[PDB]
Design a protein around this ligand. Structure first.
Ligand code: HEM
Ligand code: HEM
Ligand SMILES: O=C(CCCCCn1ccnc1)N[C@@H](Cc1ccccc1)C(=O)O
Ligand SMILES: O=C(CCCCCn1ccnc1)N[C@@H](Cc1ccccc1)C(=O)O
Lengths: 443, 449
């Protein structure tokens, strides 16, 4: 009944615990010591970190809890505005944009994006085909090139041309630096940081606003946003919110997905039996020079590989909730209306009462039957109506790309890479490098 | 442009294809062979059976198509009259009764019915608690006992007392036999059927007399929490008129018909799929045990049975118990850019085939996976139509789902279930679907009520 709490620093409470460059991993170690729930206090804030499926399944009851904006999301809101990811459920523009954008993110809508996804995927394969002997691949760097270009092209028919560049597009230079400022604000004379923050926002707004005005018909999210009408209110999105959605998609739909592909390839080369099984499926299914949409749907084991990578290292590692009314959590922890919760997704996914004792082992077979998995044990894309709208976009892209990678190359962990997980607002294996030996299969 | 059509029987055209005791399943096999649309002809009848979401989403455009009375509904109309289910949209009594009855069927209105639903649900659980060892449960029989008694009690405060009976109430014998005659007339006029006509009329009077007597007795003036009170006191905001007593009897007959066998079929199919998929049953049983913490479920607790509702929707996907509805073109129009239709042309929506459209659901359409419904927004529009379409959709949808969720939740809370015969799915067809001969054994968890 009495809730554990990690060590405190006087008036700063638990806040200095987050003044570390791997805060999610630090919070995981605290959950290892304190268990399924612990209070976390900072000046002017109290929240509770949940780690067990037993409690999180209650937290996912939408009649009792709604999405809360974490401090990280509040800081992101300063440039993502009331886009889907940084708006409250009760804000008019959330449900409005939600209704308008849902059809453009369906499994059926992936059929229209598939050709543009293949466009970027082929560029990745050709880059690796064109490496010299003994050259190596910087995996998260190239995965980010792919996912950024894919969302730019599928999102608003814009080619960032990341595979033609060493220095990334000036838009994401500001975006990454804005996200870095948002995260660093958490861990805290700083007047220069404020001036820098506004300059990075202006870079993002101007480019996006230019593309909207330039456009104002293709098979991209922008067209759907300019012409879509909310069935409920009958209203279309206004131009300001449309810019926020584009910024949101550019943020929300590149770095989490590239982290997924990076972790997936990491786990594959660290588990050669799993890599072989996935590569055998890729050769068995991808019989054409270009994968088709239906083919990608047949890459079942590759899809399991991705889910298992999302289990161990979910690249959006937490989300926040608040109690809609007074309620009792787990029959032991009474909560008042407005009390806040954090779902520590990587710790949830290590709940031995759900996954067995081998939680740290990479076994895609865990996901052969979704019905064998208890409710709310696997939450890499969030929960309920506030779940990731881009889930099917992310999984189709990652399955297509990973399938093509496994079809066309053998991979070598030539440095015996030691996993080092860099933390921004997302997770990625820093410095992960491999060598790819081409199988000489043409495109 | 050229439309497929199944084999013909000379002058009878395709009609003998329906002279089979499983016509829906036969039409499903025809759709498997011919695809998303096929013409079906009978003497004096032409229709087109739709099976793909691509075509059915257009058919569900209410600006282009309106509800048509199928031949099945026309025969039901001989005793359901101009009740809600057997009336044309343009008939004055449809919109009148629709406006009057809609508030008494809302999700909000279920709060007032909940106690009566629990009354019958407790009777079901107590019957199963009182079985002897190695005795078994006749599932659709007991589900029909429950859903009939629930609509009788919630409908007009009448207790059929089905759990005290082997032979059903004389009203229900006539109703089923009237429904059988209506369905048999589709398969079918000569002197051999003359006894059928006299019996049909005898069954109509049995239904009318009971209902009309109940209406007259109540008009003592007492007020209960039932549809009958709402119908005697409700006024259509449009016309300012209340329903007359004749239409009220047709509505009561309609509710007893429309809302007992479809709901009991749902519960029967749901339990069947549960015992055939132990992983799903375990997951559903965990939720029931966690949520239903009191001896009597509350309304709010039933709303918390999310996975149970997912189980019900997935059972409704595979075997929608009202398996079809009919439409007609309001004007000349082209369906799917290739099938031109003239005003008055008829369409049938073959719901079980729609729910097997691989282009919507993937290749695993035949597998029972409630997780398909984990997030409702992933379901395309008009891909899932177990309750019909638009303003002519099932008015009792919220009633049926609340009853079925409450009862299934209580069943999973109180018993472990065994498929002791390794039951082989055999779907009996009336105007609705049910798994004939489905039996299980229940081992009580000894949780008191
Ligand atoms: C592996 C890749 C991805 C992961 C792990 C992921 C994860 C998540 C999570 C956990 C949330 C819930 C956040 C919260 O509750 O605060 C979320 C929301 C969201 N994601 Fe993703 N995501 C991924 C890819 C994408 C993509 C590709 C897009 C866009 C194309 C996208 C757009 C969004 C949006 C708009 C929301 C907010 C939805 C709403 O609240 O209406 N994400 N994502
Ligand atoms: C799982 C259970 C049920 C299913 C699958 C179901 C299915 C349907 C379908 C498909 C229709 C449309 C018929 C057509 O378009 O020709 C319909 C209409 C109707 N149902 Fe149900 N139903 C169920 C339960 C109920 C219940 C419990 C009631 C009453 C308490 C009810 C009363 C009605 C009525 C009155 C209509 C006609 C509505 C109108 O046209 O105004 N049904 N139902
Ligand atoms: O744990 C986190 C991680 C942020 C989640 C990632 C956001 N995402 C969602 C989708 N794509 C990215 N954030 C807390 C830390 C904190 C706790 C207490 C006091 C101050 C800060 C917060 O921001 O409140
Ligand atoms: O497909 C059907 C099934 C009837 C659906 C059940 C009605 N329901 C709705 C809600 N609760 C019951 N009926 C056709 C068969 C037919 C076709 C051509 C010629 C003659 C008969 C029809 O009746 O017209």
């Amino acid at each position: 009944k009495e809730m554990p709490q990690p060590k405190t620093f006087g008036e700063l409470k638990n806040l200095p615990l987050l003044n570390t460059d791997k805060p999610v991993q630090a919070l995981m170690k605290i959950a290892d010591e304190l268990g399924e729930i612990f209070k976390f206090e900072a000046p002017g804030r109290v929240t509770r970190y949940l780690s067990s499926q037993r409690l999180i399944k209650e937290a996912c009851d939408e009649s009792r809890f709604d999405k809360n904006l974490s401090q990280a999301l509040k800081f992101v809101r300063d440039f993502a505005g009331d886009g889907l990811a940084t708006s409250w459920t009760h804000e008019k523009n959330w449900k409005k944009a939600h209704n308008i954008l849902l059809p453009s993110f369906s499994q059926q809508a992936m059929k229209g994006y598939h050709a543009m996804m293949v466009d970027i995927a082929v560029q990745l394969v050709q880059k690796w085909e064109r490496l010299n002997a003994d050259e190596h691949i910087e995996v998260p760097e190239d995965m980010t090139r792919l996912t950024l270009d894919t969302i730019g092209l599928c999102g608003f028919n814009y080619r960032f041309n990341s595979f033609y560049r060493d220095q990334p597009h000036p838009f994401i230079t500001s975006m990454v630096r804005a996200l870095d400022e948002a995260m660093n604000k958490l861990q805290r004379a700083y007047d220069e940081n404020k001036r820098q923050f506004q300059e990075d926002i202006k870079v993002m707004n101007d480019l996006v606003d230019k593309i909207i005005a330039d456009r104002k018909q293709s098979d991209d999210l922008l067209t759907h946003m300019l012409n879509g009408k909310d069935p409920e209110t009958g209203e279309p999105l206004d131009d300001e919110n449309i810019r926020y959605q584009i910024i949101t998609f550019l943020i929300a739909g590149h770095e989490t997905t590239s982290g997924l592909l990076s972790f997936a390839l990491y786990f594959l080369v660290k588990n050669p039996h799993v890599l072989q099984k996935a590569a055998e499926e890729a050769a068995r299914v991808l019989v054409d020079p270009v994968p088709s949409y239906k083919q990608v749907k047949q890459l079942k084991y590759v899809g399991m590989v991705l889910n298992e990578a999302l289990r161990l290292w979910p690249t959006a590692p937490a989300f926040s909730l608040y109690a809609k009314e007074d309620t009792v959590l787990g029959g032991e922890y009474p909560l008042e209306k407005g009390d806040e919760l954090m779902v520590l997704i990587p710790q949830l996914h290590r709940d031995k009462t759900i996954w067995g004792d081998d939680v740290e082992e990479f076994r895609p077979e865990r996901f052969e039957n979704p019905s064998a998995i208890p409710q709310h044990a696997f939450k890499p894309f969030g929960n309920g109506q506030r779940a990731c709208i881009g889930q099917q976009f992310a999984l189709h892209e990652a399955t297509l790309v990973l399938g093509m990678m496994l079809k066309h190359f053998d991979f070598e962990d030539h440095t015996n890479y030691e996993l080092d997980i860099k933390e921004t607002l997302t997770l990625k294996p820093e410095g992960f490098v491999v060598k790819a030996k081409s199988k000489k299969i043409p495109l």
